[PDB]
Amino acid sequence: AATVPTTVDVVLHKLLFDVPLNGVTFTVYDVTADFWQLVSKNGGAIEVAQTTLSQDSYQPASSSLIAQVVTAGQGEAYFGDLPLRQGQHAAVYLFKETAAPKNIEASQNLVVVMSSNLQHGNQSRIDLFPKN
Amino acid sequence: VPTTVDVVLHKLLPLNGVTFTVYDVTADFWQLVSKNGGAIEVAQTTLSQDSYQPASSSLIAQVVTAGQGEAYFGDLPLRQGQHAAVYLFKETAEASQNLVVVMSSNLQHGNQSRIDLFPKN
Ligand SMILES: [Mg+2]
Known part of the structure; x- marks a missing residue:
């Protein structure tokens, strides 16, 4: 569908303090x-x-x-x-945790900028590891 | 839900x-x-x-x-x-081999965002 880099995939990883x-x-x-x-x-x-x-x-x-x-x-x-x-x-995207099971510690919000490297089509996937 | 993939073909020297x-x-x-x-x-x-x-x-x-x-x-x-989906990749303009790629279970499940193809000669 795209002859030029038009989109990217973003996978957010919610791990615990290897879990x-x-x-x-x-x-x-x-x-x-x-x-x-x-x-x-x-x-x-x-x-x-x-x-x-x-x-x-x-x-x-x-x-x-x-x-x-x-x-x-x-x-x-x-x-x-x-x-x-x-x-x-x-593009610039905000990533919020809006729901979680009880006793799951809340994660920080992440604002991601589609920088030059991403506009140029060098990354098909961005892997995010939010703290907190 | 995983709906698309990126395919980069590499024609190397x-x-x-x-x-x-x-x-x-x-x-x-x-x-x-x-x-x-x-x-x-x-x-x-x-x-x-x-x-x-x-x-x-x-x-x-x-x-x-x-x-x-x-x-x-x-x-x-x-x-x-x-x-x-199944895609045929031809050089239309030394010539490279044609590649038929099947969007197999692994790709339907969204484990690969990019497929990197290196056709032979
Ligand atoms: Mg895409």
Whole structure:
């Protein structure tokens, strides 16, 4: 379907302090417009914008929710065919844990930027290992 | 749910400017396997022959080798209808061998995001 790198696969791994944790719901949101608006305002501070959009304060637009996926196999949450671009802009995605069994410690939110390397089609899969 | 895979064909010495064409051979492939009694390799070899003329409506994408002799085919469907997808990879413009790739159980299960093909000569 693609003659040029158009999409990437993102697998989030929920492990314990060597221990996979299956049945944990991760939700992926498109934060592309808000992300580049924040970076353009702050003067090119990418890390600062990743940290700001990773906060529990930030309430994404309800129409930004792309997919909701449960951890299976080796604590893997598979997000296939995430667009590299949202319009003319490199895509940026927020990954939140929105549901977990009881006694499963909560994971940190992750803001991922579809950087030059990914736009160029060098990686078919991104493997994320969230802390917390 | 795993719906597509990426296929990169490598034409190595890298040989850039070589046109690889990918065809959907799913229907003919499963018709051949059902006729021969489940011989997958035999059907891969039969559809890899220069004899086999694919249906004109089966051509998906035509891609030129660039960078490290790489021909990138992104978002190839794992299924064509209810069936596991099967693709024929030909050099259409020393010549390389044709490859018939089956979207097997492992690929249907989403264990590989990319298939890296190295055709012989
Ligand atoms: Mg894709």
